[PDB]
Symmetry: C4
Subunit: 355 residues, 4 copies
């Protein structure tokens, strides 16, 4: 609610072409298909093959930025990105070779930031998951057995064995309800009463384990990435020690590209930003182009009014952002700082029109 | 638990008539129907058409409050609210024109506040959703493929292709369990063990992404809307800077209409209110009608007793509200203020009966 | 994890007999049943009828505690508890009268505390639910329509109309998957991809709305019920103002009955309690029976050791309870208080064995 | 995200052999099976029987650590671990005796820590669960009845009675959707609209009850287990009282085994650790082997740089761990302590290469 993300977060075309490449697959999977388009997209494999293969050697030139790097992941696929279809092309002489389109599926995961963010937390908290995972296996067979107790007599064909019910156990426990084979007696139907009661309570925790400290990491992601852009601000030598921890939880940094808009004039003033790198277009008679290490919105927030200037993204700006309350927090947190933001709320009135 | 919402939050009849208008549809959708009521409700389309169309031109008079406004949304439907049925009435000479009752469905969304509140946060946090959305697509086809590996032999008619399983993938992953086509072998049935394990863990996060900072915005909604009604209170020049941030998170403001009740006498005293605009009916021998900028309940909360007066909504009051603890917080937070609320807890004892 | 709830929280037999009374129903609902037990439990209706009816008149004596009360709820059922079967007994001369066993179902809800706790919060927050409820209805028919677009041709018998799909809409949206009527084409099967994506995201919020501030109320329930038992402690004149708000969130009060155990000796010392009303059995050579307004566990917690005495519930004690950290918080929060709890950790060493 | 768990958390082979022992079962459950492998795994029961039975008597030697213990749980299964198959072996002369493989299922739960952690909290909070559990039973039969109202006429075979719908009630309420018997009329199909609305809102709370304070206990688990390793640090005589409560919530302690790696050089410096027991391999020209009561990472965190030394687990170290922010918190929290960590950030520069 407080951030302006722009400039192609879904940028790399390597990330893009995994999708069309795999939709090329299915037409080969279908009988009664004319051969025209059958091979027409087989080329497109050779394209994306050739395309990453074109990208590939440029990556194998890893003399770029070669000081200290960890590119075992980013290379791990690019090797097999082209070799696996190639050997598949020959030995699997039949068309089944294209079933080695199970290969590009990591290419999205290649430059998938937020996936290392995933695996980071599991190696602290999966301690829980295991004991739950065991406990899941406990309750699975602890409960799955109770059905073999009963309908083995008149449902041999369905419940004549154990795993046939362990099947129906999880399908019954895992919120699903397929509906191929269901009991007929009373007491067997009694038993389900605690099952959905369980599996929703079980995963009531177990799935909850995930968002539990995942949120902490992501709530932490906006600090670890943003204890940067702190000393850059020339004013923040005087901020109190514990002041920052109170603030940066809500501060997110994102980038805007050149030419875009940042805040339009006359819209209801709801937030203020800190510039730390780049430049803007403060739409005024004399444009007050504030570059790295600036801010704006106190003109709108102290008074609680619409906007005073159509600030637009003149260049690619590494932006911060901030809603009122946490600036009201700052105004509340320090009379020393509102002194200057009082002056700023007067300087930028005349200084907006003047040079 | 701490607020008195009244005065027709579901007020505008424009919001109302979307519902009956669309229930007018279905009778046309049914064979063996006599023509009597068939067209009888076709009028009601012409009513609601005519009704909004009556409202319409009054809205096209946008010389009301015409200083600075953003009514591109509120007009966006009202135009097509009437044009689309109209052109549909002629060119679709057959009765199918009423299938352009897909049009009014934004009219609830027209004056749906809390929908802009929805879209506000997605443009900060959907960064996550995409990488999850990709990751969802990863795990979809990463897993959907594994079924074509197997039952292509003896289930051509069901699993003779890829998307036939991608269907069964999400139906299996998305907690659903339709139950038309299910495997027969062992190992294919092994594979589901991690699927519900996944999709509940996947959406264990992904849905959790939504309420995550949505709650922040709504927890923020009760500050941004309520840093107003702060300086209105004549007593709040002395409140400490950080004092307010501690408080306003729980303070919600709502309005009561005239004539209603606010707190009845003798009920267990559980909360106190701040009046800032309007008037009340302090049911006492001499009614102490406190107008804009007042409060009541300290008579009930310091002692922890039932109510001292049947305060009733005499006029339409922009109300605040407050349970004890956060007033005990305030009483704890400041001895300077309990001094006057000690006096108030004595003045309003004699001043309740006297003038 | 920090509380000892005992003394029959599920106490009143009025709450109990709703359950057996309704299990009396089903035997009448079944053909090929001999008449012996058919009427045998019809008596048990006359019992529970007669039983509450016996309780009833004692309740109609509402001259007990008749000073100020709100018993419109608790009477509301007791009236119809007996009248509705009675008039049902005659006019419904056929056995169907017992279908007015839809009546006792409020009797659990009669003395169901925690149900007023439920309805308390909805009248602050259902503002959200409505706009979501509308939005649910938006997405329902917004999406339900798209199926009538398609399979009306070759599924008249199933999708020959609108509500036949609105049925399949919610069954598809609401996580369920019945599996009677499912599409056959491609594009109609494409559409489900956003549905489970939606309904899990929709109720990802909407159900989340419930626990959102419900937890606040229940987290508040342990303060509003426990700003009592505060001044009772003779030591708490010196506690700081903001000190209590930090503490009482974790403090829960419950009662133990006489004769029970409170903490057994030699078990790992993990918590300490505050007595405020009742008496105990401090199992020592000279039993140090501490009555209203006492505590114990600092002997175990400062040292971090097993228990020093088999404290057992001698009488019915209105107990508090407290784990270490929040007492370490208190020890950390105040050196003035650890002074006496240092003395207490020495006095109760010799005073435990001596008188 | 901040911890290094190693050394076989899933250690005891008693915990291990429950799994293979029960997979031994199913082959006996299957007709048309040759007798070769039929009995081959019957031995493996005699193995695991004999195996725990071998472990058993060593456990019955409970003269180990026999000072004060509570081993009623850990013995509770080991007794029946061997007796129940044994008596089952004879009296159940038919092969059904192996259906007493319902016995080992507690053996995982025998040494399942985190299961006592489960049951700890339920006896504080299940107060809620009951009133919800009742309320679940309310809404069950309150709603289950409404179907018998209707389709008794034309669905006797399916809805000719009450419990046949109570079945369909929970299957309809519990998110499941089996799909054997579904209504046909309009109004009966109307009724489901509030059901999924309910059960997802019901378990929207009820499952939420579990993670609610479970998280508190687990968030508490990392303090109660870690108010230890506090005074061990020779530097923590000067820490402020409330300082620790702020910190230890994030501090988790885990152990590394000998030989493992702790932090590798050149990786991006993201965290620092506190050693309190054990020794390390500070990979430098003169290895600065810091033993019990040490730390490292300030060299990497004040500057925000990669690692300065391949610290590796020389011995089995009871480790702590800490990301930056909470050390930046500490650096912010105390200028007295950054004084020494300024010196440490200079001493360990020259002291890393020197002795
Ligand atoms: K189904
Ligand atoms: K389902």
């Amino acid at each position: 609610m407080s951030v302006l993300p722009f400039l192609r977060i879904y940028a790399p075309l390597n990330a893009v072409l995994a999708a069309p490449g795999l939709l090329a697959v299915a037409a080969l999977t279908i009988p009664d298909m004319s051969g025209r388009s059958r091979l027409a997209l087989a080329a497109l494999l050779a394209v994306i093959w050739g395309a990453y293969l074109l990208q590939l050697a440029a990556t194998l030139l890893k003399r770029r930025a070669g000081v200290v790097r960890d590119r075992t992941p980013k290379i791990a696929i690019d090797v097999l990105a082209v070799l696996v279809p190639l050997a598949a092309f020959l030995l699997d002489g039949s068309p089944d070779w294209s079933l080695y389109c199970a290969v590009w599926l990591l290419k999205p995961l290649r430059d998938s930031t937020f996936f290392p963010v995933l695996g980071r937390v599991l190696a602290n908290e999966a301690r829980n998951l295991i004991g739950v995972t065991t406990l899941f296996g406990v309750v699975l067979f602890a409960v799955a057995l109770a059905a073999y107790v009963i309908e083995r007599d008149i449902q041999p064909e369905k419940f004549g064995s154990i795993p046939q019910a362990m099947w129906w156990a999880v399908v019954t426990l895992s919120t699903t309800g397929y509906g191929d084979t269901i009991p007929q007696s009373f007491a067997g139907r009694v038993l389900a009463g605690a099952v959905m009661m369980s599996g929703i309570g079980i995963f009531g925790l177990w799935a909850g384990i995930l968002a539990t400290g995942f949120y902490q990491e992501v709530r932490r992601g906006d600090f670890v990435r943003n204890w940067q852009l702190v000393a850059a601000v020339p004013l923040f030598q005087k901020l109190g020690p514990a002041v920052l921890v109170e603030i940066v939880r809500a501060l997110r940094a994102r980038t805007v590209p050149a030419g875009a808009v940042i805040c339009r004039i006359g819209e209801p003033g709801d937030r203020m930003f800190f510039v730390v790198e780049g430049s803007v277009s403060v739409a005024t008679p004399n444009p007050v182009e504030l570059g790295p290490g600036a801010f704006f919105g106190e003109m709108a927030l102290i008074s609680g009014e619409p906007r005073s200037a159509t600030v637009s993204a003149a260049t690619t700006v590494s932006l911060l952002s901030l809603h009122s309350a946490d600036f009201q927090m700052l105004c509340s947190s320090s009379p020393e700082i509102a002194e200057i933001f009082r002056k700023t709320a007067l300087e930028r009135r005349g200084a907006a029109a003047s040079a």
